[PDB]
Amino acid sequence: KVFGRCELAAAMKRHGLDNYRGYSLGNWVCAAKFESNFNTQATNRNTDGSTDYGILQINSRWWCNDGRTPGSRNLCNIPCSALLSSDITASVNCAKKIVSDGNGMNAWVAWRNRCKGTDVQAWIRGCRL
């Protein structure tokens, strides 16, 4: 599913991401824009052989099981394919664990390089939330 911007904002909001670990909703929408262009089916193969999955490009080296990431963990206790679903529940509940792992949203390199320090509130402009 390719979410609209405000559509994704509302779903993230409902699932409790707004202010999660102190990160405003616009930070999460910005991260999803640059991670997946709002496409739940996005996948990205990393140089280390792991893969990133879904709306927030969650990585198989630590967070989900894809059966093809040697030595990896599955700390969200899900198949990585769950991160590709049209319903973002699994991605959100896993993102909550990632953003709690010590470095906040810096876990998402795209967030650090493209969203951090910008006017992230613009990502929820116009949205009836």
Per the annotation, where are the binding residues?
101
Helix (H, G, I), strand (E, B) or coil at 43: strand
Q: How many residues are recorded in the chain?
A: 129
Q: How far apart are CA 40 and CA 32, in angstroms?
A: 10
CB 8 within 8 A of CB 29: yes
User: CB burial class (10 A; 0-12, 13-18, 19+) of residue 47?
Assistant: exposed
Stretches 66-74, 80-88, 93-101, 109-117: which one binds Cl ion (CB under 5 A)? Answer: 66-74
Work out how close the CB of 73 gets to Cl ion at its nearest, in angstroms, rounded to a whole number.
9
With CB under 5 A as the rule, give the number of residues binding Cl ion.
Answer: 7
**Is 26 one of the binding residues for Cl ion (CB under 5 A)?**
yes
Is 35 tagged catalytic? yes
Residues 66-85 close enough to bind Na ion by CB under 5 A: 69, 72, 74
Residues 16-55 close enough to bind Na ion by CB under 5 A: 52
* Footprint of Na ion (CB under 5 A): 52, 57, 60, 65, 69, 72, 74
